[PDB]
Amino acid sequence: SLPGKPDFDGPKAIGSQRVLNRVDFKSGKAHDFFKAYEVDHTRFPRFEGEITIDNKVSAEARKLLCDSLKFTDRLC
RNA sequence: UUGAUGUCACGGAACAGGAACUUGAACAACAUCGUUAC
């Protein structure tokens, strides 16, 4: 979640709705589209959270977890 | 404000069509202003 847990006045205050196309190839105009919300990254660049690990899990599963956390490229 | 044994959404170009156009000799002669007198 956001760091200080603030409050906004709706999704229009932090982002904007955008239409995404799906064009054809031969008669290259377009067809069915869809919509999403875009949020800029110069205003909300951080997200904090926790991971709770058992005590007697292992001593090498933590290594796999850390390497996978560093290797994860994209999200959202 | 999620629930866990299973998320290709970096799986998808806001794309495709519409002439700021049409009409116009930089040219020229008759007055203006109201009252006076019996």
Side-chain angles (χ1 to χ4, degrees):
Chain A
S1 42
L2 277 174
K5 289 260 194 65
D7 264 354
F8 307 101
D9 308 69
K12 300 286 294 304
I14 66 163
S16 78
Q17 215 169 44
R18 188 170 169 260
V19 168
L20 286 93
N21 218 8
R22 205 271 296 270
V23 316
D24 213 38
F25 185 64
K26 304 303 206 178
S27 82
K29 37 172 302 180
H31 282 332
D32 43 359
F33 57 90
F34 77 99
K35 268 185 205 132
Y37 265 93
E38 269 188 341
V39 186
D40 205 73
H41 76 105
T42 61
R43 311 147 55 87
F44 317 115
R46 278 277 288 231
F47 275 94
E48 311 178 339
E50 288 174 17
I51 292 178
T52 320
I53 308 174
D54 201 296
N55 205 4
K56 43 180 191 299
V57 48
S58 173
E60 76 205 60
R62 298 176 157 90
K63 195 178 166 291
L64 185 62
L65 179 58
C66 299
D67 286 19
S68 282
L69 266 168
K70 284 179 172 284
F71 204 62
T72 296
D73 214 335
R74 57 201 49 111
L75 204 76
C76 271

